[PDB]
C-alpha cells in the first residue's frame, strides 16, 4: 500500500535516530547532534502522521463498506 | 470519527513544528526554541498515541465482528 | 492483541515524558533532562512505529480477506 512506502522512510530515519539515541545513552552527544535528533524526530513524526491519516481513511471507508 | 479530531490537533501542532524544523535547518534556533520544540513533540506524541489506541480498538472490535 | 502490549510501553514512557513536559512548561528543565527527553522520544517513536506497522499489516491482510 501507500502506508508501506511511508513506513520505509520511518525505518531509515529511525536507524539514524537509533544512532543518536546510543550517543545519548553513552553521554557523548554534541549540541549539533542534539539539534539533528530534534529535526529527525520532527521529520519522522510528519511522516507517521500522514501514515496515520491514510490508515484512518482506509478504516472509515471500510466502515462505510459494511 | 474521533480519530479525525485528534488528527486536526496533530496537524496544527505539526505546522509549528515545521517552523522549528526550518530554524534547525537554517542554523538559527535558540535554546528556548529547542525547548519549545521538545515540548511540542511530546504534546503531539501524546495525541498520536491516543489516536493509535482508538484505531486499534476499532480494528479489534471489527475483528470481533467477523 | 500485540499492538496492545506495545501501547502499554508507549503509556509508561509517556508518563515520564509528561513529567519532562511539565518541567519545560515551568522553565526548570536541565540539559541532562533535555537529553533524557530526547532519548525517551526516540524510544517511544520506535515502539509507535512498530505498532503502526502491525496495524497496517492487519488492515492489509483483512483487505485481502474480502
Residue numbers in the entry:
A (entry chain A), B (entry chain A), C (entry chain A): 2 to 67
What text does the study give?
Here, we computationally designed monomeric and homo-oligomeric miniproteins binding with high affinity to the MERS-CoV spike (S) glycoprotein, the main target of neutralizing antibodies and vaccine development. MERS-CoV S comprises an S1 subunit, which mediates binding to sialosides via the N-terminal domain (NTD) and to the dipeptidyl-peptidase 4 entry receptor (DPP4) via the receptor-binding domain (RBD), as well as an S2 subunit which promotes virus and host membrane fusion to initiate infection,12–17. We show that these miniproteins broadly neutralize a panel of MERS-CoV S variants, spanning the known antigenic diversity of this pathogen, by targeting a conserved site in the receptor-binding domain (RBD). The miniproteins directly compete with binding of the DPP4 receptor to MERS-CoV S, thereby blocking viral attachment to the host entry receptor and subsequent membrane fusion.
Based on our previous success in designing a homotrimeric, pan-variant SARS-CoV-2 inhibitor, designated TRI2–224–27, we set out to engineer homotrimeric versions of cb3 to enable simultaneous engagement of all three RBDs within a MERS-CoV S trimer and enhance potency and breadth further through avidity. 12 trimeric cb3 constructs were designed, consisting of 6 oligomerization domains with both N- and C-terminal fusions for each oligomerization domain (denoted with prefix ‘n’ or ‘c’ to describe the position of the miniprotein relative to the trimerization domain). Two of these failed to express (nTrimer3 and nTrimer4). Evaluation of neutralizing activity against the MERS-CoV EMC/2012, Jordan/2012 and United Kingdom/2012 pseudoviruses revealed that trimeric cb3 miniproteins were endowed with at least an order of magnitude greater potency, compared to monomeric cb3, with the exception of cTrimer1, cTrimer3, cTrimer4, cTrimer5 and cTrimer6 fusions which failed to neutralize MERS-CoV United Kingdom/2012 S VSV pseudotypes (full curves for each replicate in Fig S1).
